[PDB]
Design a protein around this ligand. Structure first.
Ligand code: MET
Ligand code: MET
Ligand code: MET
Ligand code: MET
Ligand code: MG
Ligand code: MG
Ligand code: MG
Ligand code: MG
Lengths: 406, 406, 406, 406
């Protein structure tokens, strides 16, 4: 038994051309065939008529944080138990999945949220996207991802390497191995200061070359990719030269960093949305903590500008929003931002399909609508190439050959 | 006073020939003489008539885990106290000893099981084989031998170096020295991922070159041999180049690793039995944990094939079964497996006598029936060279000049 | 609206000349203009008539310890809670501020005293000088700044790196990063033994070259300056060669150390006052602990002599008293000491204005009475150039364009 | 006021000749003059008539353990509180002092015994010799001086560097600095296994070259001498090459180690007495623990032989007994042992006066009866050069110009 889909229009992920009237055949969780025109459907077990829709391969977001959504000081709850993070993550994942993103890379949570959610989803306990998690983001004492920042002296215990806070190359290995132990698919580190952390710096280098080299060599031994938070150029370059797979945000990326990324084939995940988010919010008094506000006003506005520079220079780019800052499910806005800043619509869609698939090392199974690959497809009314914002209304989502939406 | 033994046939451990009708004279715990033919016995304090038996030197198993026996999820007890491990070890050791293995190398237990058993046996508290223990196997965070794997976050404390879990060269020394402190004769490490561990990888490199070098240099200072668990080729080679004494399993051993082992004179302990064990069991649903099942199906079947390759290539080989996986006392099956995969029967017996004696650095006192060496002998009805499976019926076991069985 | 000040005499911080009759115009927290003669005041919102005073820019002390004041064994309280240190610090800061010091560099306290005081002052909770803090001084086990010295075995827990006691380069980074985490502006370490610490040595090298190099490289990544306690020449040179910003005390500074400081552009903060303090007190029986007394008698008298040598040799010098030893508010005496030991009065005043501003990296905003810079000014009756001790009677203090005293 | 002493015979520590009829004048704690013949005494405040005695300078023992005395398993108390060690140390020190040893180097105790005793004596709380302590002997995990050896798993906590058990160069520094913190004058380490420790090895190398180098460089920064326990040649050489001040025992010292010690000017402290002690006792069943007995039988007998070899080869030698093994107060027997093994009597006495003074870096103040040096003198009836065993009857002991015995 097989499923036949009549696609009015088709963006396959590889071809720079929007193809008209195509037949996609699904067998199990695989795309078994692709024929031109609308072939007869009377002989197929199931038929999905999307002649009035534009079909695309499942979309991917390389930077999400299911389990959290940034709230102002006035709105933020007093505390958030781990159980609450997990509970909220189920909903965050579902709305993201329903909006068209069938695969996501969670690069940071308290530790076991995305890992547990991924396992529950993969074993059919609930619906959601394919999740590739990094578990606890690794940082150095006081770093952007140190979970004990913003706490009075007697209100916290100094973190140990296994908890994601390290100093030196040996503690780095302990931390990387701990993520492997927790069940993570990859590694995430904050190579420079950050914005939303209750800490002084928003961009200083927080990993020594020896420490970030240790991250790469350790992750390589465990077959783990390495995503890297970085705003300041210096920390960013220590990571690019070390051989990490991707730089997130890269706010103050300079000319040298750009050529280094091109030479090493490093992926750039802009998260323009999150950038615009903190900018806008930085104008509201007491929205952010006082120590955070300055950083948000500085970093946020520069991402859109850095994005254009990186794109024109030829830096590899993969789709990433940093959803968990802004509300989950608004991932599509990232496309509109990428376009307004110089990237043509089709190139933008390819950055969330094939480019993301390569960064996650799964391009041979997902990322495009081609015979043999896994059946992850979405559909929407309208032409994304003429107005990519139409992607806000994805109304059909198929994952692993199964239809959830539509 | 002396003991005279009339051996119908004699496999001495050195000669590639089965000798007929030999007289072995035992004085104390030493083999004092070896004369041809059946000399008069009327003048000896004790006489052991084995004219209808084939005598061999005591057999050796370089890889056993007294104190445990792998059981399915359905059969496995909820918990196993240290006292229970020790209690069960007494029986495991005795049945192994009674089957003909007078000397064994225990390469791993919770920490003090084999060490305590060895001391009890050596001081005459109970009967058993000569035991050479490694105590707690050393691993890196999350490694195959990390005793805290498979445990929820709040259900375990991060292990310290002294407990056998390390990161970096200094923690390695602490761990090696701790084994010396506990009373171990040697060291055992998991240089790559493993099968029966509740962990993602079954073969990734888990020791850096610096860390495994530290293992060798540290063990050398304490006159300790180094046994190494290794399935993946990369971790395996880091260990071979570091100078370890033996590689256990070596499932995905490649051409380069083989020449390295030959050049460094490293011993290969196949444990084909354990390999075949996990393969067969991997076909039974819910026998192994879900995370373990895939690894067992992959690794297990390849050992028999790797064994043949290693043997023909000329890699040194010493007898080892990994009994503790399969039931203790079925050690003999390893011989049948070695033969079916290309090794002639006599060479197989020599690998459990003289080859094992060299790996344990005791070839000048055990390993062959020669004048001067310790009186460790076994006997069996039948010719092992024509059907080595006959070794399942060893009916005479002499250790240190004393008769236990027969 | 603006404020007009008629200054009888003016020492601006840059010019080696005392200028007569000058008009300074303050707009907000900025010095908007400087005109010659006494311009009309009828048109200014506010007028400050100081025609009978000598105006100078706000003074700076590069070495203070608000929160403590050394007391004899007989006078010292049994214990001092952290809350008491903070409470006393508010007063210590205010009297120092009222004496003319508008900016100070606190280089050491239990950890969060100066940091908390600085934040309270900067947010307008109370009056005080501009504070730049180093938080907890970093030391090696048993070092001059180890807060657990002088305690019986069962009366203390071995300190961890985050508490300011380190060993090796990795623990150094943890300690430097912890100060960044606590909110410090800079770093302070004891590179050699000290006087007031209950420890055997008063000058031995307590940081290895590798450890102090780690301090500099770590602090550089966080944009933190590095102040260094040092009496012995060897520890001092390890720090000078490492690239620290300033050497405090430098009691046994040798010819080589002097040229090194000149070559690297390192600042010398003498603290002659504190030196003379421990000398005088060392003559009183039981004033200092018995283990401290010898060190105080040795180190204290040499500072005045070393100061002259350093000055004539051309070593850069910035004003620093080590107030917290002697009473707070007597900072002015340091000027008289600098003069009596060879430094001309004007050069002394410049060392507490522009030289201090450069060491704190704020010379572009403070340190001199020049158009554009921040409005930090003081006034006194008399000519400081003819008798610098007149600075004991500063009667006008303006900070950030606001008048507190006068 | 001064004291006059008429010495029948005089061994001054420098001259290889026994001088006849000499007058020694004591002024305060100093030897103010030395005249030939017996000058008039009617004009001196005090007179000490020793015309019938042989006077020598105060004797020194470079290796003592006040606070302990090795007892058989049958005699040993169940436990020894720290308070008991200290209490017993007062007596051990006094009897040693009364036997003629005015200065001793304690190289090991639970931690604060010798340090506390030294301070009590130096401040006049009680009588005893001048003590130079090393505090807690530093060792690596399981090493000869690991205070947690011989304890069941749940009966001890893994020691930290500050407690004297280390791994790696950084932990070494923490341990050396901790001894400085406790108040030690020097450092003592066990570079190889030992005899009286409940551990497997009695001579294996237990410090890596990097670790022992760290001991020297760390101790040098604190002006501390380094004494080294060593039986095995390999560990011994790592220490000699590192630059330690003395090797204790040096049981299996080889030709290479001897030339190295000569080239580096390292002192050899034989402790022949302790050697002979464990030998004799090793013949008594159950005197030593079973794990210790073998080591004692092996090491003990070789010291006397190694001593002769070292002496003839020209290796520097300083007097040391390891009293604390054998009873305290029997220190004199070491002289008789040194003589019987090839060292002439006078050379033996010089090894406990000037040679010891050089090793303790106090040869400019003690070690010989010369004008200007401190007044530490002893007397005995008889000629030590003809029968050094006469030193068992020292009946006059003067320390710091004060008479205690006689
Ligand atoms: C895209 S703006 C930067 C957002 C990021 N989560 C940070 O806190 O630095
Ligand atoms: C011989 S198959 C491998 C068995 C080994 N005990 C493991 O778990 O990897
Ligand atoms: C200026 S004299 C030295 C004072 C310094 N606080 C010390 O204790 O060494
Ligand atoms: C002088 S024999 C050796 C004695 C030393 N205390 C040891 O236990 O090794
Ligand atoms: Mg993020
Ligand atoms: Mg095994
Ligand atoms: Mg100070
Ligand atoms: Mg000793």
């Amino acid at each position: 038994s097989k499923t036949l889909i009549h696609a009015g229009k088709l963006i396959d992920g590889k071809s720079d051309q929007v193809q008209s009237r195509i037949s996609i055949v699904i067998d199990g969780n695989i795309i078994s065939d692709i024929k031109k025109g609308f072939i007869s459907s009377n002989d197929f077990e199931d038929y999905i008529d999307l002649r009035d829709h534009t079909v695309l391969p499942g979309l991917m977001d390389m930077h999400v944080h299911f389990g959290q959504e940034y709230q102002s000081k006035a709105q933020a709850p007093i505390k958030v138990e781990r159980e609450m993070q997990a509970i909220l993550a189920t909903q965050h994942a579902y709305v993201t999945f329903k909006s068209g993103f069938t695969t996501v890379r969670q690069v940071g949570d308290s530790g076991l949220v995305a890992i547990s959610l991924r396992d529950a989803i993969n074993s059919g306990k609930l619906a959601g996207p394919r999740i590739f998690a990094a578990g606890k983001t690794i940082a150095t004492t006081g770093g952007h991802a140190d979970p004990t920042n913003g706490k009075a002296v007697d209100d916290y215990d100094y973190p140990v390497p296994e908890q994601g806070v390290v100093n030196g190359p040996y503690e780095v290995y302990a931390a990387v191995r701990q993520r492997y132990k927790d069940g993570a698919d990859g590694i995430k580190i904050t190579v420079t200061g950050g914005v939303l952390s209750v800490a002084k710096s928003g961009q200083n280098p927080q990993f020594t070359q020896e420490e970030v080299d240790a991250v790469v060599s350790a992750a390589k031994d465990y077959g783990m990719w390495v995503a890297v938070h970085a705003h300041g150029a210096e920390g960013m370059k220590r990571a690019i030269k070390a051989g990490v797979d991707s730089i997130e945000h890269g706010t103050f990326m300079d000319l040298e960093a750009m050529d280094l990324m091109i030479e090493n084939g490093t992926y750039y995940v802009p998260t323009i949305s999150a950038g615009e988010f903190v900018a806008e919010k930085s104008k509201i008094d007491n929205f952010f903590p006082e120590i955070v506000r300055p950083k948000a006003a500085s970093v946020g506005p520069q991402i859109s500008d850095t994005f254009r520079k990186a794109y024109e220079k030829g830096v590899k780019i993969a789709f990433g929003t940093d959803a968990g800052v802004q509300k989950h499910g608004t991932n599509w806005k990232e496309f509109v931002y990428m376009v307004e800043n110089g990237m043509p619509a089709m190139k933008a869609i390819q950055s969330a399909t094939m480019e993301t698939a390569k960064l996650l090392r799964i391009e041979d199974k997902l990322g495009s609508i081609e015979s043999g690959k896994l059946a992850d497809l979405i559909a929407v009314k309208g032409n994304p190439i003429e107005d990519i914002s139409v992607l806000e209304n994805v109304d059909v989502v198929i994952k692993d050959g199964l239809l959830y939406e539509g």
